[PDB]
Amino acid sequence: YPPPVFDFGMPRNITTRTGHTAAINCRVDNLGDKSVSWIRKRDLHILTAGILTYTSDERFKVVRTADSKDWTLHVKYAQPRDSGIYECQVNTEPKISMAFRLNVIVTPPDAKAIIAGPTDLYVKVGSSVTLTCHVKQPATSAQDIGPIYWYRGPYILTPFVAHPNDAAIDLQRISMESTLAEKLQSRLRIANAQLLDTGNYTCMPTTAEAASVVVNVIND
Amino acid sequence: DLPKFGELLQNVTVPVSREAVLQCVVDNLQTYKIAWLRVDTQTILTIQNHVITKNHRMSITHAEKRAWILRIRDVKESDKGWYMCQINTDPMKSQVGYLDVVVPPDILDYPTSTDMVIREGSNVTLKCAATGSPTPTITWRREGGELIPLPNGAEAVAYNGSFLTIAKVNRLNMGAYLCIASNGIPPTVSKRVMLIVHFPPMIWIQNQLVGAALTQNITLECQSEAYPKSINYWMKNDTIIVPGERFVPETFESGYKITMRLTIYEVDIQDFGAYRCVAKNSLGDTDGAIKLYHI
Numbered sequence: 013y014p015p016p017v018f019d020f021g022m023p024r025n026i027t028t029r030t031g032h033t034a035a036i037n038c039r040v041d042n043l044g045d046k047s048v049s050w051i052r053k054r055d056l057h058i059l060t061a062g063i064l065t066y067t068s069d070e071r072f073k074v075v076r077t078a079d080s081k082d083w084t085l086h087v088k089y090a091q092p093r094d095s096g097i098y099e100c101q102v103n104t105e106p107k108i109s110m111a112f113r114l115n116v117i118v119t120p121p122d123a124k125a126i127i128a129g130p131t132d133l134y135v136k137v138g139s140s141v142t143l144t145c146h147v148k149q150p151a152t153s154a155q156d157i158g159p160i161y162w163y164r165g166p167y168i169l170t171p172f173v174a175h176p177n178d179a180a181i182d183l184q185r186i187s188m189e190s191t192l193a194e195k196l197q198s199r200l201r202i203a204n205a206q207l208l209d210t211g212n213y214t215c216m217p218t219t220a221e222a223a224s225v226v227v228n229v230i231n232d
Numbered sequence: 233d234l235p236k237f238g239e240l241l242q243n244v245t246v247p248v249s250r251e252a253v254l255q256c257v258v259d260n261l262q263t264y265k266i267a268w269l270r271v272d273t274q275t276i277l278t279i280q281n282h283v284i285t286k287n288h289r290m291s292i293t294h295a296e297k298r299a300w301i302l303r304i305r306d307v308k309e310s311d312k313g314w315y316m317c318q319i320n321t322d323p324m325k326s327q328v329g330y331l332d333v334v335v336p337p338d339i340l341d342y343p344t345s346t347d348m349v350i351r352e353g354s355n356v357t358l359k360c361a362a363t364g365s366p367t368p369t370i371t372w373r374r375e376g377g378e379l380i381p382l383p384n385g386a387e388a389v390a391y392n393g394s395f396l397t398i399a400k401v402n403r404l405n406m407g408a409y410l411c412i413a414s415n416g417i418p419p420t421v422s423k424r425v426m427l428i429v430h431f432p433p434m435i436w437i438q439n440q441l442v443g444a445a446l447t448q449n450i451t452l453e454c455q456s457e458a459y460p461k462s463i464n465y466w467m468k469n470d471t472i473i474v475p476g477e478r479f480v481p482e483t484f485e486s487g488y489k490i491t492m493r494l495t496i497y498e499v500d501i502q503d504f505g506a507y508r509c510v511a512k513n514s515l516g517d518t519d520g521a522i523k524l525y526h527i
């Protein structure tokens with residue numbers, strides 16, 4: 013028989029942005045009938061034993077794959093106080109264990125793109141459409157300003173960025189303007205709307221989470 | 233109104249190969265869950281009534297409502313250490329207690345000193361290593377209760393320490409020493425260590441002047457100290473003296489002491505003169521004169 017053994021190639025330094033769900037994946041081969049436990053080394057707080065959750069902090073849960081090879085510890089709404097060493101533990105005797113380090117960073121602050129207006133627009137053929145996107149972020153912006161791109165579905169619209177892109181969309185009717193007037197902003201205009209312009213337009217920043225509007229061009 | 237610990241995690245002492253029984257008391261547990269675990273290795277032991285460890289020697293029982301009892305059958309010394317009781321409150325609560333596993337002491341052959349052979353006036357160090365739980369204190373004694381030369385220039389009938397260093401060893405220091413290991417857990421064990429002191433011979437003579445008359449039987453006698461044991465013979469006119477039907481030399485040996493006699497039967501006018509008793513061993517020789525004269 014083969015004793016359970018860890019896959020020591022799994023990432024051992026998880027880094028999560030505060031507010032996001034942190035995930036520490038632990039893979040054990042040849043588990044057999046042995047269980048995997050997640051424990052906090054700092055104070056010995058048992059987090060999960062098998063699929064049973066022991067801790068009462070609602071943000072901690074363990075998930076295993078169907079084949080029980082991959083055990084993952086999820087920390088919802090991670091906060092810096094969660095940074096530390098967590099031990100993946102198999103109940104052999106003696107017990108084996110691997111140690112992962114969670115580092116919950118806080119810089120930069122949460123940034124989220126917003127597109128003023130309803131989420132699903134409906135415009136007639138020949139009409140014009142304008143989508144105004146801006147990044148909601150704390151006061152401190154400083155030198156953390158990056159380009160903002162647009163997409164219709166999976167196809168980027170910003171010219172001279174994706175090279176080569178054989179799926180480039182004709183920009184004769186579509187213009188984009190990115191200005192930084194205190195607040196980082198980007199405006200997309202479609203002139204003379206056409207049925208083929210219908211799609212899921214996405215405002216894709218490089219310093220903030222993306223947002224999207226669905227644009228529907230219709231007849232009449 | 234969260235769960236509370238009814239009392240400390242009681243310390244438990246247990247001799248090897250018996251059953252350890254740690255007990256954790258929780259009041260108002262409610263829907264919360266109690267968990268045992270070993271602290272040094274951070275090993276989850278049990279949660280509620282389930283045993284997480286595959287260690288067949290551990291079990292958990294919950295007869296009384298407030299007492300969760302962890303049982304370790306056939307304990308080993310490797311089970312000695314801190315154990316923890318944990319409640320999955322928020323924040324989590326935990327208390328710890330110690331499981332002490334006592335082992336009667338034992339003296340290791342190494343590095344415990346074997347027999348020692350030292351020249352008189354030189355250093356020697358007797359070592360002795362023992363294993364136990366608690367760790368045994370080592371005590372040195374001598375057979376018969378003789379004094380042990382202490383490092384601080386003094387002397388005493390016992391010395392505590394794993395190594396006993398003697399500077400300037402004396403023939404009186406020679407004999408059997410005892411390494412005695414004890415730790416409160418019977419039985420106490422001990423190991424004998426021989427300290428052997430070698431030195432050249434010395435001779436003492438009670439009567440360096442003895443007289444007699446013809447036909448008389450007189451006996452001359454010397455005393456020597458020498459170790460290793462010395463060969464002792466008599467001389468006269470610089471000539472050895474063999475048992476010759478009239479002269480009969482003897483030796484009475486006891487340790488490093490020797491009493492040598494020369495019994496002369498039927499004294500003759502030619503016997504009178506200067507005798508010599510001699511003692512010789514590896515480290516040197518010595519002698520002493522006895523004059524036999526006429527009445």
Ligand SMILES: *[C@@H]1O[C@H](CO[C@@H]2O[C@@H](C)[C@@H](O)[C@@H](O)[C@@H]2O)[C@@H](O[C@@H]2O[C@H](CO)[C@@H](O[C@@H]3O[C@H](CO)[C@@H](O)[C@H](O[C@H]4O[C@H](CO)[C@@H](O)[C@H](O)[C@@H]4O)[C@@H]3O)[C@H](O)[C@H]2NC(C)=O)[C@H](O)[C@H]1NC(C)=O
Nearest residue numbers: 032163164165166167212213214216221222223224225226
């Ligand atoms: C319109 O288009 C945007 C852009 O996404 C596009 O995806 C590709 C197809 C390609 O075209 C890209 O160029 C383009 O960016 C769509 O936005 C995505 O929407 C999904 C929602 O289904 C998001 O998925 C979520 O991601 C979160 C990241 O933290 C994650 O937490 C979420 O997990 C939760 O929800 C899932 C179910 O969705 C659940 O399984 C989990 O357990 C958990 O609860 C979730 O995975 C993407 O992040 C969005 N991507 C971007 C870039 O914004 C948009 O959906 C699409 N259509 C509409 C109607 O808006």
Ligand SMILES: *[C@@H]1O[C@H](CO[C@@H]2O[C@@H](C)[C@@H](O)[C@@H](O)[C@@H]2O)[C@@H](O[C@@H]2O[C@H](CO)[C@@H](O[C@@H]3O[C@H](CO)[C@@H](O)[C@H](O)[C@@H]3O)[C@H](O)[C@H]2NC(C)=O)[C@H](O)[C@H]1NC(C)=O
Nearest residue numbers: 240241242243244245246313314328329330331332333366
């Ligand atoms: C519960 O038991 C632990 C462990 O003690 C061990 O088990 C007991 C059942 C007895 O058999 C003991 O003889 C045995 O050693 C106790 O912890 C021990 O406490 C003492 C005193 O606080 C510690 O001594 C200290 O040692 C440090 C380090 O040098 C010094 O700085 C201190 O000044 C002091 O001397 C001892 O280290 C510690 N043992 C361990 C393993 O850490 C504990 O007190 C006891 N609790 C009770 C009875 O309530």
Ligand SMILES: *[C@@H]1O[C@H](CO[C@@H]2O[C@@H](C)[C@@H](O)[C@@H](O)[C@@H]2O)[C@@H](O[C@@H]2O[C@H](CO)[C@@H](O)[C@H](O)[C@H]2NC(C)=O)[C@H](O)[C@H]1NC(C)=O
Nearest residue numbers: 021022023024025026027028095096112113114115116117
């Ligand atoms: C994993 O991280 C440790 C600790 O480094 C910290 O954590 C990182 C994740 C990062 O986010 C920063 O907070 C720190 O760098 C690494 O161990 C360190 O290694 C450096 C040299 O590379 C050494 O100078 C430090 O003393 C180490 N610190 C400790 C606590 O040991 C480790 O190398 C990282 N491993 C991987 C695979 O990235």
Ligand SMILES: *[C@@H]1O[C@H](CO[C@@H]2O[C@@H](C)[C@@H](O)[C@@H](O)[C@@H]2O)[C@@H](O[C@@H]2O[C@H](CO)[C@@H](O)[C@H](O)[C@H]2NC(C)=O)[C@H](O)[C@H]1NC(C)=O
Nearest residue numbers: 367368369370371372388389390391392393414415416417
């Ligand atoms: C040699 O040591 C023993 C052991 O006693 C020590 O006492 C502790 C303070 C600590 O030093 C531990 O290592 C030992 O337990 C001595 O025996 C003790 O004597 C005292 C009186 O002085 C008595 O109260 C204790 O009960 C004794 N210990 C035991 C276990 O019974 C002994 O006196 C020492 N002898 C020499 C010559 O140093």
Ligand SMILES: *[C@@H]1O[C@H](CO[C@@H]2O[C@@H](C)[C@@H](O)[C@@H](O)[C@@H]2O)[C@@H](O[C@@H]2O[C@H](CO)[C@@H](O)[C@H](O)[C@H]2NC(C)=O)[C@H](O)[C@H]1NC(C)=O
Nearest residue numbers: 445446447448449450476477478479480495496497498499
């Ligand atoms: C002096 O010694 C002689 C010889 O006897 C010695 O002692 C014996 C025990 C034995 O060891 C012999 O080999 C020794 O030579 C003594 O003579 C003897 O005396 C006893 C008692 O008087 C007598 O019974 C024996 O027959 C004697 N034998 C001989 C051969 O003489 C003698 O008495 C001693 N002198 C004195 C004063 O004691």
Ligand SMILES: *[C@@H]1O[C@H](CO[C@@H]2O[C@@H](C)[C@@H](O)[C@@H](O)[C@@H]2O)[C@@H](O)[C@H](O)[C@H]1NC(C)=O
Nearest residue numbers: 354355356382383384385396397398399400
């Ligand atoms: C013999 O030992 C001499 C010193 O005796 C010891 O010194 C102190 C530090 C303690 O060990 C104590 O037990 C004794 O008083 C040395 O000066 C000398 O060099 C040594 N010589 C030999 C040959 O061992």
